[PDB]
Amino acid sequence: HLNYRQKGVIDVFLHAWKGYRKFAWGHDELKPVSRSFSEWFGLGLTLIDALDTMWILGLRKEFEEARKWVSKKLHFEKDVDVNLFESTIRILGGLLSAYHLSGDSLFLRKAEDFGNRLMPAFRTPSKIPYSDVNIGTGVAHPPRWTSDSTVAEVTSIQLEFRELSRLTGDKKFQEAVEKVTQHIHGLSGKKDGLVPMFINTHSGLFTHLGVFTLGARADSYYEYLLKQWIQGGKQETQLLEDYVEAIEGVRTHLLRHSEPSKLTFVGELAHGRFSAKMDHLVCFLPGTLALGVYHGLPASHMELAQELMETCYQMNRQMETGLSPEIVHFNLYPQPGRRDVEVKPADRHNLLRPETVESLFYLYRVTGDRKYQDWGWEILQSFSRFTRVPSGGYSSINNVQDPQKPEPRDKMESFFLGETLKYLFLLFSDDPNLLSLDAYVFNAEAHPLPIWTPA
Ligand SMILES: CO[C@H]1O[C@H](CO)[C@@H](O)[C@H](O)[C@@H]1S[C@H]1O[C@H](CO)[C@@H](O)[C@H](O)[C@@H]1O
Numbered sequence: 001h002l003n004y005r006q007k008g009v010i011d012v013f014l015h016a017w018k019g020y021r022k023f024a025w026g027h028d029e030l031k032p033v034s035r036s037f038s039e040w041f042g043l044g045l046t047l048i049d050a051l052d053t054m055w056i057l058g059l060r061k062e063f064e065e066a067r068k069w070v071s072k073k074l075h076f077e078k079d080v081d082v083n084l085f086e087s088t089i090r091i092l093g094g095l096l097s098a099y100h101l102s103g104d105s106l107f108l109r110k111a112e113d114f115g116n117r118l119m120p121a122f123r124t125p126s127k128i129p130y131s132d133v134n135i136g137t138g139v140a141h142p143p144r145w146t147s148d149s150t151v152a153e154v155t156s157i158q159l160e161f162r163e164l165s166r167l168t169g170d171k172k173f174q175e176a177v178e179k180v181t182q183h184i185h186g187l188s189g190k191k192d193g194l195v196p197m198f199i200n201t202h203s204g205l206f207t208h209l210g211v212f213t214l215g216a217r218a219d220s221y222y223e224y225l226l227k228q229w230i231q232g233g234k235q236e237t238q239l240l241e242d243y244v245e246a247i248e249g250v251r252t253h254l255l256r257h258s259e260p261s262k263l264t265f266v267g268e269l270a271h272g273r274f275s276a277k278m279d280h281l282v283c284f285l286p287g288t289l290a291l292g293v294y295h296g297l298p299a300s301h302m303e304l305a306q307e308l309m310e311t312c313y314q315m316n317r318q319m320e321t322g323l324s325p326e327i328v329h330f331n332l333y334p335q336p337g338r339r340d341v342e343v344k345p346a347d348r349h350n351l352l353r354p355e356t357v358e359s360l361f362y363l364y365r366v367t368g369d370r371k372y373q374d375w376g377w378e379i380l381q382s383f384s385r386f387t388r389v390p391s392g393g394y395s396s397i398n399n400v401q402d403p404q405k406p407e408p409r410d411k412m413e414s415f416f417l418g419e420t421l422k423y424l425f426l427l428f429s430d431d432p433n434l435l436s437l438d439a440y441v442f443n444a445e446a447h448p449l450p451i452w453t454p455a
């Protein structure tokens with residue numbers, strides 16, 4: 001039976017989806033304020049990202065309609081450059097999850113076609129993949145000013161390629177992504193398990209040495225060490241070792257406490273200088289920590305998970321709209337009249353990102369503490385109050401500090417339906433058998449993939 005809060009999530013989903021159907025059907029993203037759409041893949045991104053969410057929420061007539069579009073309209077031969085990481089976590093991941101939940105081999109067929117078109121990205125001197133690959137022409141290349149790739153981008157594609165190999169029996173996917181993981185396992189230039197942001201595709205070595213963040217460009221490296229370890233049946237001890245090492249590195253080098261509330265937060269390090277800057281992206285970490293504890297990581301990880309969950313909650317509730325901005329700054333020393341969570345004017349956007357509600361889901365699953373459900377409901381009510389578009393859809397906003405003029409940006413990112421509402425639906429569920437942590441691991445875009453239950 002669905003409960004009150006899950007029904008609320010479904011209502012939000014269906015209001016979002018009626019905008020997508022009316023104004024953006026088959027297109028990458030809804031622009032709900034202007035009742036139009038944008039493309040970058042041209043591959044129905046929001047539709048693919050929401051397949052498994054529709055299935056999970058019981059939206060079966062919508063799922064059927066979307067499946068028909070996948071069957072007749074999804075084609076990968078266009079002359080278009082795609083980012084390998086975004087392609088992998090959203091489209092390859094979303095198709096694999098749709099396959100597993102529905103049992104419909106259409107989704108696997110499409111996944112295999114797509115994965116084969118991404119493989120030219122790995123054709124580099126070091127076998128660290130280029131950032132971009134053209135799925136129609138087979139040409140892959142780095143960005144225009146550099147032969148570096150982003151460390152998170154090359155280390156956050158493994159679940160999907162590993163699973164694709166398992167399902168298809170074609171080893172090329174697994175072999176390509178596992179080479180990357182094994183290579184990075186042996187690289188110099190880490191700080192107590194912390195990785196730099198960039199890696200050169202010619203030399204295979206890290207660049208931008210001495211600069212450490214758990215936010216953009218590095219965050220999901222850590223997430224995918226743990227998740228690959230779980231996926232593989234907990235038999236790949238190097239992944240676990242590198243994860244355990246990295247968490248101690250976080251404790252040693254990046255953790256500080258805010259003023260006035262003494263909240264634990266994760267900052268950035270540049271040539272030994274600490275910076276109290278924290279991307280909302282870093283709020284993945286409490287959930288990943290708690291996930292690890294469920295799977296046997298040390299209790300110290302749970303203490304840190306609970307502290308960071310409170311901080312991420314405050315990053316939301318200390319804003320006038322109750323929604324976290326893209327980037328916050330904390331004060332290490334007392335500042336008269338200031339809250340814990342400071343926000344630069346440029347950073348005040350909210351893009352409907354999932355990381356807080358993602359981590360609330362894990363913290364509730366592992367602890368059973370219903371306050372985490374309450375916190376997620378609070379955030380959802382804030383989404384409804386300040387980002388809802390009457391004709392359909394929800395929009396990113398430019399000013400989380402102005403409840404009267406939040407200033408919509410006219411875009412519904414695919415991860416609102418792929419991630420934010422999925423995690424909220426699961427957070428509110430009365431059923432631990434629903435996508436059990438014993439049976440699935442979620443990829444970087446909330447697409448559940450089966451755990452390889454071991455020998
Ligand atoms: C710019 O930040 C994004 O890209 C870098 C890699 O260039 C990642 O390190 C970072 O996690 C995010 S991707 C992240 O963003 C969305 C949620 O905010 C969503 O696509 C998904 O969760 C993805 O992991």
Ligand SMILES: [Ca+2]
Binds near residue numbers: 445
């Ligand atoms: Ca993510």
